[PDB]
Amino acid sequence: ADEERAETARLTSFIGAIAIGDLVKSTLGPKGMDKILLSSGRDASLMVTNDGATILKNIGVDNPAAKVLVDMSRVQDDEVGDGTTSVTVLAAELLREAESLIAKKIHPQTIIAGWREATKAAREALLSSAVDHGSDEVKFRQDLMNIAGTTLSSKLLTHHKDHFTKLAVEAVLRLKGSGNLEAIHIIKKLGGSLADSYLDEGFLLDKKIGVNQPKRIENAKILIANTGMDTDKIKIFGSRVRVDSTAKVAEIEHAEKEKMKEKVERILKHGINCFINRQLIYNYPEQLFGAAGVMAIEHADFAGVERLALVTGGEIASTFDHPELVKLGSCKLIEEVMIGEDKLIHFSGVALGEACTIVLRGATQQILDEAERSLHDALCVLAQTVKDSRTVYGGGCSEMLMAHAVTQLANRTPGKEAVAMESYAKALRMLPTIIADNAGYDSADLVAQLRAAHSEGNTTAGLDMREGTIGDMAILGITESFQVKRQVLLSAAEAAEVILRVDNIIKA
Amino acid sequence: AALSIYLENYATSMGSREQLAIAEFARSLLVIPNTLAVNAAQDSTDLVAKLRAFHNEAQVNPERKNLKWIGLDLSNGKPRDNKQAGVFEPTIVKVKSLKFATEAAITILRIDDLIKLH
Amino acid sequence: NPIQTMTEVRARQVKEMNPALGIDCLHKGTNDMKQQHVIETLIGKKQQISLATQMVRMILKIDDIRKPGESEE
Amino acid sequence: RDKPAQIRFSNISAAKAVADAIRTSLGPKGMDKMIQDGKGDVTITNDGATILKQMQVLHPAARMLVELSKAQDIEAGDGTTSVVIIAGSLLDSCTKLLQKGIHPTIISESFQKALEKGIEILTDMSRPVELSDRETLLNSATTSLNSKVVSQYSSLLSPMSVNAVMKVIDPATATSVDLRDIKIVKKLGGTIDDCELVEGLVLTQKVSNSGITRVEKAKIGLIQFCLSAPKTDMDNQIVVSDYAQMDRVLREERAYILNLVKQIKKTGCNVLLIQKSILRDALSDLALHFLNKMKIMVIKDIEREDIEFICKTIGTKPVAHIDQFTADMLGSAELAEEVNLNGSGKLLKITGCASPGKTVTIVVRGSNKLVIEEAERSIHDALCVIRCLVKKRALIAGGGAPEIELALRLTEYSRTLSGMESYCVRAFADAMEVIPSTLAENAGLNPISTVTELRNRHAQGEKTAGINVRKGGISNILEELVVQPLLVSVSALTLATETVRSILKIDDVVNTR
Amino acid sequence: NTKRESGRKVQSGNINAAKTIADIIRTCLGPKSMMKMLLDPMGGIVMTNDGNAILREIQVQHPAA
Amino acid sequence: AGFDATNILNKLRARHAQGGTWYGVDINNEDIADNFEAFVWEPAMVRINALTAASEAACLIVSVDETIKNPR
Amino acid sequence: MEGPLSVFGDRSTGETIRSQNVMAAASIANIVKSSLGPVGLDKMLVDDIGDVTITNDGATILKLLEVEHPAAKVLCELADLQDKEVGDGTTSVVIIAAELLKNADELVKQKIHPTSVISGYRLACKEAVRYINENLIVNTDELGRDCLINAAKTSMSSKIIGINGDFFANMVVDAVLA
Numbered sequence A: 001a002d003e004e005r006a007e008t009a010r011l012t013s014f015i016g017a018i019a020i021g022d023l024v025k026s027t028l029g030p031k032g033m034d035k036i037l038l039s040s041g042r043d044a045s046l047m048v049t050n051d052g053a054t055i056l057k058n059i060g061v062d063n064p065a066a067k068v069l070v071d072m073s074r075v076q077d078d079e080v081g082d083g084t085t086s087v088t089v090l091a092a093e094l095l096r097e098a099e100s101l102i103a104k105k106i107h108p109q110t111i112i113a114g115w116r117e118a119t120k121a122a123r124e125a126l127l128s129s130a131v132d133h134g135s136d137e138v139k140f141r142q143d144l145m146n147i148a149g150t151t152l153s154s155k156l157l158t159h160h161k162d163h164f165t166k167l168a169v170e171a172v173l174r175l176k177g178s179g180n181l182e183a184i185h186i187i188k189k190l191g192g193s194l195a196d197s198y199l200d201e202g203f204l205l206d207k208k209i210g211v212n213q214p215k216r217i218e219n220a221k222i223l224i225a226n227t228g229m230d231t232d233k234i235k236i237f238g239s240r241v242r243v244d245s246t247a248k249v250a251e252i253e254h255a256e257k258e259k260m261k262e263k264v265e266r267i268l269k270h271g272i273n274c275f276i277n278r279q280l281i282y283n284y285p286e287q288l289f290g291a292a293g294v295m296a297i298e299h300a301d302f303a304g305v306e307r308l309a310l311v312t313g314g315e316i317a318s319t320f321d322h323p324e325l326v327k328l329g330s331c332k333l334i335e336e337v338m339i340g341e342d343k344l345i346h347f348s349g350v351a352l353g354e355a356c357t358i359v360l361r362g363a364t365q366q367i368l369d370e371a372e373r374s375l376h377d378a379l380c381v382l383a384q385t386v387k388d389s390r391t392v393y394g395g396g397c398s399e400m401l402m403a404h405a406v407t408q409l410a411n412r413t414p415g416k417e418a419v420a421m422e423s424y425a426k427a428l429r430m431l432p433t434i435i436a437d438n439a440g441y442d443s444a445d446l447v448a449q450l451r452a453a454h455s456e457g458n459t460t461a462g463l464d465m466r467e468g469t470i471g472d473m474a475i476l477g478i479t480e481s482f483q484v485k486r487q488v489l490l491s492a493a494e495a496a497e498v499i500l501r502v503d504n505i506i507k508a
Numbered sequence B: 001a002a003l004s005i006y007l008e009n010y011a012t013s014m015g016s017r018e019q020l021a022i023a024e025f026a027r028s029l030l031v032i033p034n035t036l037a038v039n040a041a042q043d044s045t046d047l048v049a050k051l052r053a054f055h056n057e058a059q060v061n062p063e064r065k066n067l068k069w070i071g072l073d074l075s076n077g078k079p080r081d082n083k084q085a086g087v088f089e090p091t092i093v094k095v096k097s098l099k100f101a102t103e104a105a106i107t108i109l110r111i112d113d114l115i116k117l118h
Numbered sequence C: 001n002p003i004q005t006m007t008e009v010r011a012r013q014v015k016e017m018n019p020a021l022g023i024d025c026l027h028k029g030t031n032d033m034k035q036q037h038v039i040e041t042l043i044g045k046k047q048q049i050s051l052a053t054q055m056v057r058m059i060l061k062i063d064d065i066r067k068p069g070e071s072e073e
Numbered sequence D: 001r002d003k004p005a006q007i008r009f010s011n012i013s014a015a016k017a018v019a020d021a022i023r024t025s026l027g028p029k030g031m032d033k034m035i036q037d038g039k040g041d042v043t044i045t046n047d048g049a050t051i052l053k054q055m056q057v058l059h060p061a062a063r064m065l066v067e068l069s070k071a072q073d074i075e076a077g078d079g080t081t082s083v084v085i086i087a088g089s090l091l092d093s094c095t096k097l098l099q100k101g102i103h104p105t106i107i108s109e110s111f112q113k114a115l116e117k118g119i120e121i122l123t124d125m126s127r128p129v130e131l132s133d134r135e136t137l138l139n140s141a142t143t144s145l146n147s148k149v150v151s152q153y154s155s156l157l158s159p160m161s162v163n164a165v166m167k168v169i170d171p172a173t174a175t176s177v178d179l180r181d182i183k184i185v186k187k188l189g190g191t192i193d194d195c196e197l198v199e200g201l202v203l204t205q206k207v208s209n210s211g212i213t214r215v216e217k218a219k220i221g222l223i224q225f226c227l228s229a230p231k232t233d234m235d236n237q238i239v240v241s242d243y244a245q246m247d248r249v250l251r252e253e254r255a256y257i258l259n260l261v262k263q264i265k266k267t268g269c270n271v272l273l274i275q276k277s278i279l280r281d282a283l284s285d286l287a288l289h290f291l292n293k294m295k296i297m298v299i300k301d302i303e304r305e306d307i308e309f310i311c312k313t314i315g316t317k318p319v320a321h322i323d324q325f326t327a328d329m330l331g332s333a334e335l336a337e338e339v340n341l342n343g344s345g346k347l348l349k350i351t352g353c354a355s356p357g358k359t360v361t362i363v364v365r366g367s368n369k370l371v372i373e374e375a376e377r378s379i380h381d382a383l384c385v386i387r388c389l390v391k392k393r394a395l396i397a398g399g400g401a402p403e404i405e406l407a408l409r410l411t412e413y414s415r416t417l418s419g420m421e422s423y424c425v426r427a428f429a430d431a432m433e434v435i436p437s438t439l440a441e442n443a444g445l446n447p448i449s450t451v452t453e454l455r456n457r458h459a460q461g462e463k464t465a466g467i468n469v470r471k472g473g474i475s476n477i478l479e480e481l482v483v484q485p486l487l488v489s490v491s492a493l494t495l496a497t498e499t500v501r502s503i504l505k506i507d508d509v510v511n512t513r
Numbered sequence E: 001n002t003k004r005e006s007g008r009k010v011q012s013g014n015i016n017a018a019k020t021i022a023d024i025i026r027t028c029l030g031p032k033s034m035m036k037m038l039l040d041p042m043g044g045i046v047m048t049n050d051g052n053a054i055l056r057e058i059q060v061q062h063p064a065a
Numbered sequence F: 001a002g003f004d005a006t007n008i009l010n011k012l013r014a015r016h017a018q019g020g021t022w023y024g025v026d027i028n029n030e031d032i033a034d035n036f037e038a039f040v041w042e043p044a045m046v047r048i049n050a051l052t053a054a055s056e057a058a059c060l061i062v063s064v065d066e067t068i069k070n071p072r
Numbered sequence G: 001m002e003g004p005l006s007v008f009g010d011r012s013t014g015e016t017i018r019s020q021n022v023m024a025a026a027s028i029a030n031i032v033k034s035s036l037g038p039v040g041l042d043k044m045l046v047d048d049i050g051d052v053t054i055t056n057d058g059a060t061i062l063k064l065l066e067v068e069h070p071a072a073k074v075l076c077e078l079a080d081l082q083d084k085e086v087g088d089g090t091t092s093v094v095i096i097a098a099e100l101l102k103n104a105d106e107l108v109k110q111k112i113h114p115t116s117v118i119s120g121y122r123l124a125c126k127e128a129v130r131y132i133n134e135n136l137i138v139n140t141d142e143l144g145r146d147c148l149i150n151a152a153k154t155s156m157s158s159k160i161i162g163i164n165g166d167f168f169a170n171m172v173v174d175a176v177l178a
Helices: A006-024 A052-057 A064-079 A083-103 A108-128 A137-151 A160-173 A248-256 A258-268 A283-292 A302-312 A365-387 A397-412 A418-428 A433-439 A443-447 A449-456 A482-501 B002-014 B019-039 B047-054 B091-110 C002-015 C042-058 D002-020 D048-054 D060-075 D082-100 D104-125 D134-147 D154-168 D243-267 D285-293 D304-312 D369-391 D401-417 D421-429 D437-441 D453-461 D487-504 E008-027 E051-055 F005-017 F045-062 G015-034 G058-064 G070-085 G092-108 G116-132 G148-158 G169-175
Strands: A002-004 A035-039 A045-049 A186-189 A197-199 A203-205 A217-224 A274-276 A295-297 A329-339 A342-348 A358-361 A390-392 A461-464 A469-472 A505-507 D033-036 D042-045 D196-198 D200-203 D219-223 D269-274 D297-299 D348-351 D361-363 D395-397 D483-485 E036-039 E045-048 F023-025 F032-034 G043-046 G052-055
Touching: A002 A006, A006 A052, A006 A064, A006 A083, A006 A482, A006 A505, A035 A052, A045 A052, A045 D060, A052 A064, A052 A083, A064 A083, A064 A482, A083 A108, A083 A418, A083 A482, A108 A397, A108 A418, A108 A482, A137 A160, A137 A365, A160 A197, A160 A365, A186 A365, A203 A302, A248 A258, A258 A283, A274 A329, A283 A295, A302 A329, A358 A365, A365 A482, A390 A482, A397 A418, A397 A449, A397 A461, A433 A443, A433 D104, A443 A449, A449 A461, B002 B019, B002 F005, B002 G116, B019 B047, B019 F005, B019 G015, B019 G092, B019 G116, B091 G070, B091 G092, B091 G116, C002 D421, D002 D060, D002 D082, D002 D487, D033 G070, D042 D048, D048 D060, D060 D082, D060 D487, D082 D104, D082 D421, D082 D487, D104 D401, D104 D421, D104 D487, D134 D154, D134 D369, D134 D483, D154 D196, D154 D369, D200 D304, D200 D361, D219 D304, D243 D269, D243 D285, D269 D304, D285 D297, D369 D483, D369 D487, D395 D401, D401 D421, D401 D453, D437 D453, D483 D487, E008 E051, E036 E051, E045 E051, F005 F023, F005 F032, G015 G058, G015 G070, G015 G092, G043 G058, G052 G058, G058 G070, G070 G092, G092 G116, G148 G169
Parallel strands: A186 A358, A217 A274, A274 A295, D219 D269, D269 D297
Antiparallel strands: A002 A505, A035 A045, A197 A358, A203 A342, A217 A329, A329 A342, A461 A469, D033 D042, D196 D361, D200 D348, D395 D483, E036 E045, F023 F032, G043 G052
16 A cells, blocks of 8 residues: 655665665674674674674664565675675675766766676676686695685684694595585584684494494495384284373373384384484484394484495485385494584595585583584585686685776776766775774775786785775685676676666555 | 770871771761760760870779779769769670660761652 | 874884974875974974963963953953 | 764763772771662671672673673672773773874873783783692682681681692693682581582582491492483373373382382493473482482482583583493592581582593582671682682782882883873873772762862882881881782783773664664 | 651650641530531541540541541 | 762761871862872961861851841 | 652652652651650551551561562661561661761762771761760669669669569569579
8 A cells, every 4th residue: 555656765775775785894804893793682692793694684674675685695705605795795885886877967877787788897807816726736735725714704613624624624625526515514613712622534323322333333234214113103003092090191102102112113123234214313212222232323324325425435315115126325333433522423534525524612502603604605616616726816806806997897887877887886985984993094095006006917806905005805814706706796787777677566 | 985085096096087087086086975965964065075084194094993994974964983883884885885876987988879759 | 184194103203203204284195304404493483382371371361251241241 | 973982981071970889998988888779679788799799780882891800700700890990090090181183092002001011010010829838729729818808717727728729720830720620619607617629520510318338338320311211201101180090100110210229220320410491300209219229329400500510520421321331431430529517508519530631629518698708708809819820820919009009100100102002091090000099989968178189109119119008007018917928919900901992982873673 | 668757856746736626616615515527438427425426427637636 | 179079078088087187189189188298388376267267157147047038 | 849750669769769769768767766765655546447556666567568669678678687686776766877878879979988987987876875874873773872673663663563673672682682
């Protein structure tokens, strides 16, 4: 019943972007400050958020034009990594500029074209600066060490950044032709050190060996199945009914101990002590499995057989109806390792290929959660280095490389569109403004000076705002992938132009 | 009466900041014979007249002296110079009364961190 | 930026005492006082010390701040 | 916009206005608080440390002050009011620097150099101790308790604490004292003079049938399970809807349990700790009587903390059924002792048990429950003083004198910084001196005189001397013999540092959806 | 509770309560009796030569009544 | 001069319970002392005139609680 | 009421709440002033709406009262401590302390060390007890010009039944000995 006119719907599109762009521009760049999420709508809690997805999703936007911005920044963060942060600011920086065009009363279609061809102008200038550093093996080793130093940064880590750096660089170079995105597994558990992250030689399942079971199984022959139990096992064609009063409620809870014995008779005929199942057990079934001589290994998954499939040479399979439909497992040694605070069984053997298992140590859940996404951002981007070894100068040095050339193309090529092409390039230089205050440097002396400086010579010289100075982006190692910077432009350019074509919001 | 006086005489001998700790304490003793005098309709001004007129500076000694007196009868509210009356309460009931009356002003001080709660 | 400006010559006082090397105001980027040639009389600066503490002394001189309706009227 | 600047100013101003009346600590200063809630609860308070623990605030920057006292209690256990008043001193400095026009980001790494020089200078004035020496561990824990409430309990509860740590700690270079090692129990019966330090694990289990195994003939059992029996964990083969049918399942229930309780008596395991996993109040009340007839010290649905120590101290792991003849992952005991002082109290002592090198236990007794509580908090604070020395062996002055003694020195090092952070830290280095003045400030009339006087005398005293903390006046507080560990202060340095830095990390306040 | 009333105002308030009771009953005294008429709060007339039947049925004031 | 002003007075009274020679405060030596031995001098008659004049005005104003005016 | 009411717990944070409780304590103390001593005035105090009592015993009054201030509260607590000792002397401790808690905040503020005013209170308390032990100037009842008879006759003259108490003097002398 509400048809909102263009003059407010355009204004809603801008204030929808400004009210969210300022939220994360603290956390952008080397992030001299953060964003502190405050929980009062759901519970009484406090969150330190450099993750934009924690900023975007946990604070649900009520501006419908801002809803487009959250969604398109979400998919960018999912595939490439670090996409909620970079896309949303650059879209918000464009829409501050577009108000001055509407203040000058520019055709909105000119603004649609003006950022679009300038986006084409920027990516070519971004492509000209894209240079290979993963060429030779010693180069490809030192290529990924500096990039993982950059991608794991702009987040909150105590000592984690250098050890998640040198671990993942070892994982990429061993495959030589693809990245490891197929069967490596991020295991997070309670640890005592805020620095440790080690690669597994083998793979691990959650099994705290208890009552009387042995600690090491040798000469493994694994029966892989999906049939299991938690506490319930009724008869095949029979049943037991014990309810006619209020005293039967206690006796129907006592019958769950005798249900656990019927499933043990099934595994006992096999004579296979290496039986894994997807379902869990308690202290009450575990006294019954190990007493028969056949050990039940719970908390299994598809991921364990898939990790066993690539290195050893087997296959991953499921739907346990007959045992020839699920591909079985073979191992040399089954040992229980103690990682962090947690005891897990570990099927150790052949390793080091298309499949690994990454275990994380930290007693704080908040430290473990931020370390997941920070490692999740790089492994795709380090796989993008396998796709394109072209790196580009991180920290906004590549940002000024595009603002240098688009501004030149904003003058010559158009005849009316120059006011719309310049609002692109001025918003490009707003990205060093939001980081210069974070290091404390004057934003006005930053954005024009170095843009002309490294473009006319020594493009390696860029923004070293871990000092508040100008530094070299290949000597100080502050460089990232050409692919990650290429993808965040198109998502930022489109979503602004989508809600700019919005000139009628109607609320039914 | 002498405790209002000869503690303040004792207070000056202590010197510094702790003097008015004793002096305001000994000043607050004066209202007890005063308000009982108003209840006895004697009204507090002959009561501060006589008791200061007794207390000798050259003879700060009480012993049984004909040069200073400290007694006062309360049922008339007027000082009848007596030492056999049933209006003069012993040591034991008084020394403990000096404790808790001192302690009550200390009792309000025992706060740390004045706050609110939602 | 004056906030940057107080930082630099403060480090120069860690470097060198009794400075002939203070800030510039010609934006030449050469912060001196003997090569920027910004030099004044010592009597004049010393007079400015006497005059500034005179005024704070002057407004402290009586304890009277009462008026009949007419002390600034 | 004006909105991020005004909230950061208000986030400072709200928690600081809370922290303004928190400068009312250190003894008798001010007027009492009968606090009425929004629900109307009568809250009569006199202790500012528990006030910080109970502190209900809705403002989220002030909600970090709650965790600031929680982190101070878990790290040092000393000066929970002291970490707040120095964090209120942090909120003093951050206002005018923004009014100067300094970035809040620059003030964040301004806090680093205050912390880095601060832990350095306090190290320079501190002197370490030797963590195998009974004397140096004794002189500091009592001196802190002499500044605290008890003074006659300081003579007895402190050497019990010194012998407590030496069981738990290794020789001198070691960091192993946890509050999750020593359990402080409560025993009605006996008194504070009747308290006892027991070497091993003492659990606070309520054990029925006093008159039980009191001897070395004992093993201990932590069971994650219960005894399998008909109408306990097995089943009855008839139905019950009648009172006459009810008696027939009661007879076959208690008959098989009698076969169960003798086999545990056969084992020599006289202790069974049952977790909180109920079926019918998990192990039967008929079953506990026959265990008591076999003199077995049992309880059901015991708390989680009792389970954690018995797995930690001796190493007791869950086993199979006693009909399945338990796999001897139960702990080997050399004393199961039921304790009865004046016929009251239910307590288990396990003396001479296995240990991982730690975990001594105390028996805190008392004639009333309040008589328990007076020595309970007193020996617990006596543990936390030496625990600071275990984690960091060094001696500084007690009473807040090194807070100002750091401040006299740091301003000189603030001049050597010569940065923009030189002006920021110096603005806080002057803010640290306020602790004798502002604690005195919230009382009565004639206000202008005393405040700056309480801070001149330290600056007149020196970098080496200042005002006394127990009688006042300029003297060496070490010659006044008032000591505290370094970790009392340097933890309060770091904990206050991160939080007010995190206030600088706040912008554009949000609420969840 | 916490309540304190300053002296003269209560002793005078004792006078105003008692004297007004003493007004009509002095004229209700003896063979020169008047009658103290209470109108009922639910309607209805009551007059006697005894104010105790009048006062105990009606709202008695606190201070001296 | 900068003092706890009342606590100075408490100090000067002890030196009048023990001495009582010239004990006052110094503003120019910034402490407590004998002001004749601190040489702060002025003739005694103007004090005697001040003691009479301060007593005269004080008893006079309290003697008037009834003041008559004429606005015509 | 003075001070802010937006905050909870009736907190006024400073000189107003220090001016609040000196009003809250004195009004408690003013009740005992009317009822002080044997000449003290009897107060008719309503219990709920119809139940009344007539007292000049201050401890009995404070049993009736329900405190709503800490200045109301701690005066009831300290007076009951003397009440379980004897029950006498409970009147004196209430009236004096209202002036004392006016005087204490002004000076414990003024610390070189804050307990010196409190120790000055205790030194004043101990200065009393020493001279309390030095008192034989007034109040001997262990003897008199004749005996305990001289103590008891003036004690039975203090309790009036007319001019009598002469024959009644010998009863009090016998009573500790009978």
